[PDB]
Amino acid sequence: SGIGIGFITDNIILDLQLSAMEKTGNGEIVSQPKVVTSDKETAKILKG
């Protein structure tokens, strides 16, 4: 990904590189399940 190459070869081969990586990842997941339940009773939505 990130390589900065300085090369001499003709006079001498002298290689000087600054190799840097910056990675950015953002993941956002927003899920909303709605369940209709009796009162004081259990009801269950399961999505899997």
Partner 1 sequence: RLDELRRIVSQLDIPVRQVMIEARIVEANVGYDKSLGVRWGGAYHKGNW
Question: What is the binding site for partner 1 (CB under 8 A)?
Answer: 1-3, 5, 7, 15
Interacting residues of 1 by C-beta distance below 8 A, sequence separation 6+: 21
CB of 1 or CB of 32, closer to partner 1: 1
Contact 21, 1 (CB under 8 A): yes
CB of 13 or CB of 40, closer to partner 1: 13
- Measure the CA–CA gap between 21 and 12, rounded to whole angstroms: 28
Residue 36 C-beta: closest distance to partner 1, Å: 11
CB of 20 or CB of 40, closer to partner 1: 20
